[PDB]
Amino acid sequence: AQNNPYLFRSNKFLTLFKNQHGSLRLLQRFNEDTEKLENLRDYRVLEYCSKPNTLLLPHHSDSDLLVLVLEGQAILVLVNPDGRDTYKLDQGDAIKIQAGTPFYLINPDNNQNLRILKFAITFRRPGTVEDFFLSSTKRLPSYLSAFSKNFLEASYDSPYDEIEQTLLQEEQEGVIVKMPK
Amino acid sequence: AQNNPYLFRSNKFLTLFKNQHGSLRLLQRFNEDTEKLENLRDYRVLEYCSKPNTLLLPHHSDSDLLVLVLEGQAILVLVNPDGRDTYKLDQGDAIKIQAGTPFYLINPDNNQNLRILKFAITFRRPGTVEDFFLSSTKRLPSYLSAFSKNFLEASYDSPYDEIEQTLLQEEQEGVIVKMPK
Amino acid sequence: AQNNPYLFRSNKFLTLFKNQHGSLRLLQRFNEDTEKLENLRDYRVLEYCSKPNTLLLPHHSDSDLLVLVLEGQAILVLVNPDGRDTYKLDQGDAIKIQAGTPFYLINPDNNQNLRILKFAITFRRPGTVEDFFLSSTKRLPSYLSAFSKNFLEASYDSPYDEIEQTLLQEEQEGVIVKMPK
Amino acid sequence: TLSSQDKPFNLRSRDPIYSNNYGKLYEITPEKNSQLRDLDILLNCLQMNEGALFVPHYNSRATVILVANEGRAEVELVGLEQQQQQGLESMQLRRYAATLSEGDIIVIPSSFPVALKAASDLNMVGIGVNAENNERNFLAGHKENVIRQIPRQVSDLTFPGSGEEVEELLENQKESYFVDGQPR
Amino acid sequence: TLSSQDKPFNLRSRDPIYSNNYGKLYEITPEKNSQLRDLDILLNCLQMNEGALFVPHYNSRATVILVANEGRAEVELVGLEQQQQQGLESMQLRRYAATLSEGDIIVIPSSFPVALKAASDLNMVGIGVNAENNERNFLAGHKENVIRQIPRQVSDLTFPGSGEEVEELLENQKESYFVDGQPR
Amino acid sequence: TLSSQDKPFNLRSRDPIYSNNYGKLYEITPEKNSQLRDLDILLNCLQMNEGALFVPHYNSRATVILVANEGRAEVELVGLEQQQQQGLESMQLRRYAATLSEGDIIVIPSSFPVALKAASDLNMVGIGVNAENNERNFLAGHKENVIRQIPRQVSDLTFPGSGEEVEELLENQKESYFVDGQPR
């Protein structure tokens, strides 16, 4: 394609970061094809699915997120500098994740999966939604990997060699882990 | 034109409808030619006129409407979802007609016409207003009709060759008509 | 500049005024080269340097400015249609200067140079900060000069060439002056 | 599950604007919900019995992002978009119909009329931007049907057919929001 | 017009802000009106007699869409215009003017100084966007003449003239907002 | 400053949020400045001595404009920028780093981390936009460090290390925001 047949109808979600127990899709920019839904530029939809016993390693988004439970049952931990706050999503349960707060979403135990609806409200840039991960995995390495060894030596009070060890990684699996136990 | 060096001076509308009852005319994007008027993107000035004893058939509107009476007298009926709120509007008067509110302008008997300024506050396609007329015409048929048989069918729990005959018509004196008066 | 997309490092301005007494410098729009700064789109950043014992002729800004002293101390008089308001600022002081308010900055009795960081907050013309000075300059006449001879003379209640003596000079020093004695 | 939970602490879904033999429609609004205000968004659940069809209507100002969760949806969305085809007759009518399956997203613009037929045991979630003070006003049905408050001698001139005539074609639906989507 | 009746109903023109015998100006700011406030728009009713000169000046923040409702008008509007004249001295001073008549519009930008002449019995109507907290600053007349408010040495340092001699001219204007503009 | 304040009044730079022997940080927010409140701007005053390091962190919602007043600064933001990636790809990691000299500006967007090296004794002034509710997260040093709130279960699953092994890395740091980045 290229430029909306008018269309308000939309089935295509690009492949963010899938796996053998995961998924992560981000629906295209409403105003990519069409001139018509202009008021909807600064928003994006991310549909993310996962099997039982799996995690979604901490990362922050630079966007304000509104979360939604389409199918399944979940558990949302939200990490801030003085403690963590823990929630449960269950059917239809909805919650608003505040742009910039690192957070990890899990799906407990059973045999039914998890289906979440992520709705992004964008500030630093319209359309753009960048989720920032702490882990060096197959594809992307960890952001703590973009500073100079000197920064990491200075910052940490450990040796590049101590750092690089709990820095980067094989993350064979990647971003949608399996709930070890 | 469309390429217009420095002016904040305007004169040119667009006929939207003229019949010897009245006309509607809609001003041009304050920014179609200038670059200075950039903050004026979502407003449009509409000039509406009607000859004594007249009806501007019920239609809803896209945007928020600020209406003033620059000449005349009129009757504002504001069709609510479960009522009507009629209002006598002497000249000099103004009133904010919210969007997606079906309204109708009577021009009461007499001698002198009506002249209404229609400043629009557009949200949807910023700078693009739209009008939803319910009465079929030689221009645009009733919106109610772009639907489907099986839809109009229980939508009205009636039979097509009659709903049709209670929706699709001819209105020569289309948009602006003449009451029984 | 001209072209450098991907950059955050801004380190090159624009002189609007320069004289052996002071400087007035505006910086590149934050989205000049790059689309990556869409957000900072409404904000311009200025810089004002003045030698000791200088006056910054009255004038008003089309936009809101955030003003904050980097080196020195100063005198700021805000003309109101009521009277004037005068404030003395030292390192770190800051105040807000809404649009439309005419104002002047003095650098007092001392050998001390002046450094003022002027954050402008555009609204009328986006990314655009305009300046409206009352005095005549071999750099721009004073806006009071654009009016007709009649319009001028009527407002004033003084014959033309009586007016041409407020009206236009050879205001030696342009916009930065050498405050008196 | 979390006692000393609170603030942007979850939210779910209590009481429906519409409820009948044919469906349910739940709404959570900025007006009513702490973290919906500042987001300026309305949240909604569509539960529909196989065969029912959401009565033709429009929202005043919330654009609704129709996401299909379960089942097949049959959608008709009336429209005519851009202000560059003016002199009236230009921007004309265009029916946008389609069948939503699991996961498809359809977008319902601020003023446009829309009607939903339940193609098969349905559930639909609706996100809506611009919600404050927003209302639905039904073009069909029997409840909050506007054309039902357009007067006799208003109608009669507005519509082909009699005041009483029009006046009745609206009496024919003994129901309000969801009806029976059987065909013709 | 209705027993049971309390919404945001309609307003008009109540108590002038400027009246003298050359003219009148009525305002309705966001600050005192409800519907106007959620629009952040003000309205104006200019009533000017043939011979009037609605003195030069400017608004602090609202952008005024001026409409000519009754009679003819000659406006003068000044502007540093397009920074997109990243020059000064390469940044120019343009004067634009019009003898506008009925159904003719002039748009009056935020800090641009404007002055309007009253060629016949005149009626204008305005609308101000960004209407809030807007202050009108007069560049002439007695009351609210921003120029009167610059002290001596400065004013001295600012005009080709001298503090008093300039102070002199300042309070020469007999009157206040609208003035008799009979040629010379 | 003023016998006649009630408008803007003057704001200077009162108590520090982050203070110690390496540096200082003086932020004024909108939550505590009517003037800055109306406007949505936050200010700061970063103090530092040569060899001092301003640990890795990122603002939640504020886009900070860093102005170099007196001194030389090694910067380092780190990024993940574009969206016409889509299917993952393109979306690469950047290290943008520099030397700020007097009058050198640097922009520090909302969710990016950054760390500032103070090659000399250094003064900077920053202006954050969209400062409301700004939070500033740390990923290093004892305090405000978010990578340390995370619990072991997850930790050892996030990182190639082990809950404590990592745990040590995290305790390694005796200090808080400000440090000594002795060469190497």
PDB file of C-alpha atoms in Angstrom, chain D:
ATOM      1  CA  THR D   1      -5.065  -7.915  46.209  1.00  0.00           C
ATOM      2  CA  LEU D   2      -3.367  -4.702  47.164  1.00  0.00           C
ATOM      3  CA  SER D   3      -4.951  -2.960  50.155  1.00  0.00           C
ATOM      4  CA  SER D   4      -2.733  -0.107  50.552  1.00  0.00           C
ATOM      5  CA  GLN D   5      -2.873  -0.002  46.710  1.00  0.00           C
ATOM      6  CA  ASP D   6      -4.079   3.501  45.582  1.00  0.00           C
ATOM      7  CA  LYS D   7      -3.518   6.393  43.199  1.00  0.00           C
ATOM      8  CA  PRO D   8      -3.158   5.225  39.686  1.00  0.00           C
ATOM      9  CA  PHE D   9      -4.160   1.957  41.118  1.00  0.00           C
ATOM     10  CA  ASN D  10      -6.332  -0.067  38.755  1.00  0.00           C
ATOM     11  CA  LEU D  11      -9.825   0.440  37.274  1.00  0.00           C
ATOM     12  CA  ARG D  12     -12.260  -2.110  35.728  1.00  0.00           C
ATOM     13  CA  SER D  13     -16.040  -1.575  34.729  1.00  0.00           C
ATOM     14  CA  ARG D  14     -19.237  -0.813  37.026  1.00  0.00           C
ATOM     15  CA  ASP D  15     -22.765  -0.421  35.401  1.00  0.00           C
ATOM     16  CA  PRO D  16     -23.818  -0.210  31.750  1.00  0.00           C
ATOM     17  CA  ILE D  17     -25.447   2.751  29.818  1.00  0.00           C
ATOM     18  CA  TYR D  18     -27.249   0.177  27.765  1.00  0.00           C
ATOM     19  CA  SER D  19     -28.678  -3.183  28.748  1.00  0.00           C
ATOM     20  CA  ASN D  20     -31.230  -5.440  27.050  1.00  0.00           C
ATOM     21  CA  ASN D  21     -31.785  -8.853  25.562  1.00  0.00           C
ATOM     22  CA  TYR D  22     -29.429  -7.885  22.690  1.00  0.00           C
ATOM     23  CA  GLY D  23     -26.328  -6.384  24.360  1.00  0.00           C
ATOM     24  CA  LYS D  24     -24.373  -4.274  26.947  1.00  0.00           C
ATOM     25  CA  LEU D  25     -22.384  -1.094  26.715  1.00  0.00           C
ATOM     26  CA  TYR D  26     -20.147   0.005  29.558  1.00  0.00           C
ATOM     27  CA  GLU D  27     -18.474   3.315  29.816  1.00  0.00           C
ATOM     28  CA  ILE D  28     -15.797   4.851  32.059  1.00  0.00           C
ATOM     29  CA  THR D  29     -15.277   8.606  31.388  1.00  0.00           C
ATOM     30  CA  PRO D  30     -12.895  11.382  32.212  1.00  0.00           C
ATOM     31  CA  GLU D  31     -15.773  12.952  34.044  1.00  0.00           C
ATOM     32  CA  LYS D  32     -15.889   9.876  36.339  1.00  0.00           C
ATOM     33  CA  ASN D  33     -12.384   8.574  36.425  1.00  0.00           C
ATOM     34  CA  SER D  34      -9.325  10.124  37.994  1.00  0.00           C
ATOM     35  CA  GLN D  35      -6.747   9.141  35.350  1.00  0.00           C
ATOM     36  CA  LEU D  36      -8.987   9.523  32.390  1.00  0.00           C
ATOM     37  CA  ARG D  37      -9.423  13.296  32.697  1.00  0.00           C
ATOM     38  CA  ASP D  38      -5.820  14.254  31.934  1.00  0.00           C
ATOM     39  CA  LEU D  39      -5.537  11.669  29.394  1.00  0.00           C
ATOM     40  CA  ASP D  40      -8.710  12.855  27.945  1.00  0.00           C
ATOM     41  CA  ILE D  41      -9.986   9.417  26.976  1.00  0.00           C
ATOM     42  CA  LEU D  42     -13.243   7.243  27.386  1.00  0.00           C
ATOM     43  CA  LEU D  43     -12.962   3.436  27.952  1.00  0.00           C
ATOM     44  CA  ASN D  44     -15.601   1.002  26.706  1.00  0.00           C
ATOM     45  CA  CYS D  45     -16.817  -2.645  26.543  1.00  0.00           C
ATOM     46  CA  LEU D  46     -19.256  -3.922  23.820  1.00  0.00           C
ATOM     47  CA  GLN D  47     -20.994  -7.198  24.613  1.00  0.00           C
ATOM     48  CA  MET D  48     -23.356  -8.298  21.891  1.00  0.00           C
ATOM     49  CA  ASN D  49     -25.581 -11.292  21.123  1.00  0.00           C
ATOM     50  CA  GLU D  50     -25.234 -12.941  17.708  1.00  0.00           C
ATOM     51  CA  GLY D  51     -27.585 -11.037  15.376  1.00  0.00           C
ATOM     52  CA  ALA D  52     -28.089  -7.725  17.129  1.00  0.00           C
ATOM     53  CA  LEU D  53     -27.023  -4.528  15.441  1.00  0.00           C
ATOM     54  CA  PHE D  54     -25.873  -1.358  17.136  1.00  0.00           C
ATOM     55  CA  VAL D  55     -28.310   1.284  16.251  1.00  0.00           C
ATOM     56  CA  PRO D  56     -27.224   4.073  13.770  1.00  0.00           C
ATOM     57  CA  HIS D  57     -25.782   7.020  15.719  1.00  0.00           C
ATOM     58  CA  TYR D  58     -22.800   9.244  16.302  1.00  0.00           C
ATOM     59  CA  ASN D  59     -20.751  10.567  19.230  1.00  0.00           C
ATOM     60  CA  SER D  60     -20.475  14.265  19.686  1.00  0.00           C
ATOM     61  CA  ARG D  61     -16.783  14.517  20.118  1.00  0.00           C
ATOM     62  CA  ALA D  62     -14.960  11.364  21.091  1.00  0.00           C
ATOM     63  CA  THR D  63     -13.203   9.596  18.389  1.00  0.00           C
ATOM     64  CA  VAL D  64     -13.554   5.953  19.103  1.00  0.00           C
ATOM     65  CA  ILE D  65     -10.876   3.432  18.321  1.00  0.00           C
ATOM     66  CA  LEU D  66     -12.966   0.264  17.764  1.00  0.00           C
ATOM     67  CA  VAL D  67     -10.761  -2.745  18.602  1.00  0.00           C
ATOM     68  CA  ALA D  68     -12.027  -6.200  17.941  1.00  0.00           C
ATOM     69  CA  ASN D  69     -11.304  -8.592  20.705  1.00  0.00           C
ATOM     70  CA  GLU D  70     -13.659 -11.412  20.146  1.00  0.00           C
ATOM     71  CA  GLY D  71     -16.016 -12.397  17.445  1.00  0.00           C
ATOM     72  CA  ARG D  72     -17.017 -10.920  14.126  1.00  0.00           C
ATOM     73  CA  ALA D  73     -18.400  -7.456  13.828  1.00  0.00           C
ATOM     74  CA  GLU D  74     -20.276  -6.064  10.860  1.00  0.00           C
ATOM     75  CA  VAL D  75     -19.612  -2.323  10.566  1.00  0.00           C
ATOM     76  CA  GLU D  76     -21.148   0.481   8.585  1.00  0.00           C
ATOM     77  CA  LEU D  77     -19.535   3.840   9.095  1.00  0.00           C
ATOM     78  CA  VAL D  78     -20.932   6.835   7.150  1.00  0.00           C
ATOM     79  CA  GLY D  79     -18.464   9.682   6.116  1.00  0.00           C
ATOM     80  CA  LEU D  80     -17.101  12.703   3.947  1.00  0.00           C
ATOM     81  CA  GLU D  81     -13.822  14.080   5.454  1.00  0.00           C
ATOM     82  CA  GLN D  82     -11.545  17.028   3.887  1.00  0.00           C
ATOM     83  CA  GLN D  83     -12.392  20.817   3.445  1.00  0.00           C
ATOM     84  CA  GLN D  84     -11.039  21.371  -0.007  1.00  0.00           C
ATOM     85  CA  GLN D  85     -13.973  20.007  -1.874  1.00  0.00           C
ATOM     86  CA  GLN D  86     -16.267  22.855  -0.978  1.00  0.00           C
ATOM     87  CA  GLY D  87     -19.076  24.578  -2.721  1.00  0.00           C
ATOM     88  CA  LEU D  88     -21.290  22.020  -1.006  1.00  0.00           C
ATOM     89  CA  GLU D  89     -22.000  19.131  -3.349  1.00  0.00           C
ATOM     90  CA  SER D  90     -18.239  18.322  -3.428  1.00  0.00           C
ATOM     91  CA  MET D  91     -17.234  16.305  -0.337  1.00  0.00           C
ATOM     92  CA  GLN D  92     -20.106  13.736  -0.870  1.00  0.00           C
ATOM     93  CA  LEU D  93     -21.279  10.556   0.984  1.00  0.00           C
ATOM     94  CA  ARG D  94     -19.085   7.315   1.146  1.00  0.00           C
ATOM     95  CA  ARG D  95     -20.138   4.222   2.996  1.00  0.00           C
ATOM     96  CA  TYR D  96     -17.329   2.543   4.943  1.00  0.00           C
ATOM     97  CA  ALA D  97     -18.402  -0.884   5.804  1.00  0.00           C
ATOM     98  CA  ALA D  98     -16.461  -3.888   6.795  1.00  0.00           C
ATOM     99  CA  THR D  99     -16.196  -6.965   8.853  1.00  0.00           C
ATOM    100  CA  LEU D 100     -14.047  -6.901  11.836  1.00  0.00           C
ATOM    101  CA  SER D 101     -12.509 -10.111  13.023  1.00  0.00           C
ATOM    102  CA  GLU D 102     -10.395 -10.859  15.981  1.00  0.00           C
ATOM    103  CA  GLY D 103      -7.876  -8.029  16.364  1.00  0.00           C
ATOM    104  CA  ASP D 104      -8.944  -5.695  13.651  1.00  0.00           C
ATOM    105  CA  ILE D 105      -9.116  -2.138  14.494  1.00  0.00           C
ATOM    106  CA  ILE D 106     -11.585   0.288  12.935  1.00  0.00           C
ATOM    107  CA  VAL D 107     -11.627   4.045  13.773  1.00  0.00           C
ATOM    108  CA  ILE D 108     -14.918   5.979  14.455  1.00  0.00           C
ATOM    109  CA  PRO D 109     -14.488   9.776  13.597  1.00  0.00           C
ATOM    110  CA  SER D 110     -16.030  12.491  15.712  1.00  0.00           C
ATOM    111  CA  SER D 111     -19.122  13.187  13.804  1.00  0.00           C
ATOM    112  CA  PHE D 112     -19.865  10.336  11.530  1.00  0.00           C
ATOM    113  CA  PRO D 113     -22.762   8.026  11.854  1.00  0.00           C
ATOM    114  CA  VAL D 114     -22.036   4.381  12.527  1.00  0.00           C
ATOM    115  CA  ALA D 115     -24.054   1.156  13.098  1.00  0.00           C
ATOM    116  CA  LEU D 116     -22.797  -2.232  14.288  1.00  0.00           C
ATOM    117  CA  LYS D 117     -24.233  -5.584  13.330  1.00  0.00           C
ATOM    118  CA  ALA D 118     -23.137  -8.566  15.378  1.00  0.00           C
ATOM    119  CA  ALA D 119     -21.814 -11.017  12.763  1.00  0.00           C
ATOM    120  CA  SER D 120     -21.137 -13.545  15.578  1.00  0.00           C
ATOM    121  CA  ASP D 121     -20.968 -13.560  19.413  1.00  0.00           C
ATOM    122  CA  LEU D 122     -19.279 -10.252  20.031  1.00  0.00           C
ATOM    123  CA  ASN D 123     -17.145  -8.309  22.513  1.00  0.00           C
ATOM    124  CA  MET D 124     -15.504  -5.018  21.460  1.00  0.00           C
ATOM    125  CA  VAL D 125     -13.302  -2.605  23.259  1.00  0.00           C
ATOM    126  CA  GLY D 126     -13.407   1.111  22.559  1.00  0.00           C
ATOM    127  CA  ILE D 127     -10.795   3.707  23.325  1.00  0.00           C
ATOM    128  CA  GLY D 128     -11.878   7.237  22.768  1.00  0.00           C
ATOM    129  CA  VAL D 129      -9.787  10.432  22.388  1.00  0.00           C
ATOM    130  CA  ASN D 130     -11.595  13.738  23.231  1.00  0.00           C
ATOM    131  CA  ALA D 131     -14.205  12.594  25.698  1.00  0.00           C
ATOM    132  CA  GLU D 132     -15.056  15.407  27.880  1.00  0.00           C
ATOM    133  CA  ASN D 133     -18.714  16.379  27.546  1.00  0.00           C
ATOM    134  CA  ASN D 134     -19.193  13.861  24.664  1.00  0.00           C
ATOM    135  CA  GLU D 135     -22.568  12.307  23.970  1.00  0.00           C
ATOM    136  CA  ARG D 136     -24.216   9.791  21.720  1.00  0.00           C
ATOM    137  CA  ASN D 137     -27.391  10.677  20.034  1.00  0.00           C
ATOM    138  CA  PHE D 138     -29.256   7.904  18.272  1.00  0.00           C
ATOM    139  CA  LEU D 139     -30.496   8.303  14.598  1.00  0.00           C
ATOM    140  CA  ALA D 140     -32.467   5.172  15.081  1.00  0.00           C
ATOM    141  CA  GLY D 141     -33.922   3.221  17.840  1.00  0.00           C
ATOM    142  CA  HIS D 142     -36.502   4.680  20.133  1.00  0.00           C
ATOM    143  CA  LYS D 143     -34.283   6.033  22.936  1.00  0.00           C
ATOM    144  CA  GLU D 144     -32.298   9.262  22.781  1.00  0.00           C
ATOM    145  CA  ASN D 145     -33.325   9.323  19.198  1.00  0.00           C
ATOM    146  CA  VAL D 146     -32.931  12.883  18.175  1.00  0.00           C
ATOM    147  CA  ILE D 147     -35.152  12.909  15.019  1.00  0.00           C
ATOM    148  CA  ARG D 148     -37.810  12.099  17.476  1.00  0.00           C
ATOM    149  CA  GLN D 149     -37.562  15.596  18.916  1.00  0.00           C
ATOM    150  CA  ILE D 150     -37.714  17.448  15.673  1.00  0.00           C
ATOM    151  CA  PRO D 151     -41.199  18.896  15.439  1.00  0.00           C
ATOM    152  CA  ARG D 152     -44.120  17.978  13.218  1.00  0.00           C
ATOM    153  CA  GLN D 153     -43.913  20.972  10.969  1.00  0.00           C
ATOM    154  CA  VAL D 154     -40.253  20.837  11.194  1.00  0.00           C
ATOM    155  CA  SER D 155     -40.129  17.181  10.166  1.00  0.00           C
ATOM    156  CA  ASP D 156     -42.733  17.472   7.369  1.00  0.00           C
ATOM    157  CA  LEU D 157     -40.518  20.005   5.537  1.00  0.00           C
ATOM    158  CA  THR D 158     -37.349  18.257   6.486  1.00  0.00           C
ATOM    159  CA  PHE D 159     -38.601  14.851   5.193  1.00  0.00           C
ATOM    160  CA  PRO D 160     -40.357  13.292   2.184  1.00  0.00           C
ATOM    161  CA  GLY D 161     -43.620  12.219   3.733  1.00  0.00           C
ATOM    162  CA  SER D 162     -46.005  13.578   6.383  1.00  0.00           C
ATOM    163  CA  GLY D 163     -45.256  14.816   9.905  1.00  0.00           C
ATOM    164  CA  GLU D 164     -47.407  12.019  11.288  1.00  0.00           C
ATOM    165  CA  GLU D 165     -45.716   9.926   8.686  1.00  0.00           C
ATOM    166  CA  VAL D 166     -42.161  10.503   9.806  1.00  0.00           C
ATOM    167  CA  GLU D 167     -43.598  10.574  13.304  1.00  0.00           C
ATOM    168  CA  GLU D 168     -44.427   6.975  12.936  1.00  0.00           C
ATOM    169  CA  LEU D 169     -41.574   5.450  11.052  1.00  0.00           C
ATOM    170  CA  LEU D 170     -39.967   6.170  14.447  1.00  0.00           C
ATOM    171  CA  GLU D 171     -42.682   4.496  16.496  1.00  0.00           C
ATOM    172  CA  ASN D 172     -42.049   1.215  14.770  1.00  0.00           C
ATOM    173  CA  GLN D 173     -39.052   0.204  16.888  1.00  0.00           C
ATOM    174  CA  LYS D 174     -40.219  -0.799  20.220  1.00  0.00           C
ATOM    175  CA  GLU D 175     -36.558  -0.646  21.181  1.00  0.00           C
ATOM    176  CA  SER D 176     -33.733   1.500  22.022  1.00  0.00           C
ATOM    177  CA  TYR D 177     -30.188   0.672  21.297  1.00  0.00           C
ATOM    178  CA  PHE D 178     -29.425  -2.708  20.127  1.00  0.00           C
ATOM    179  CA  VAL D 179     -32.028  -4.285  17.932  1.00  0.00           C
ATOM    180  CA  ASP D 180     -32.524  -7.249  15.900  1.00  0.00           C
ATOM    181  CA  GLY D 181     -30.219  -7.425  13.072  1.00  0.00           C
ATOM    182  CA  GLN D 182     -32.166  -9.958  11.115  1.00  0.00           C
ATOM    183  CA  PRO D 183     -32.056  -9.203   7.336  1.00  0.00           C
ATOM    184  CA  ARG D 184     -34.229  -8.354   4.358  1.00  0.00           C
TER     185      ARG D 184
END
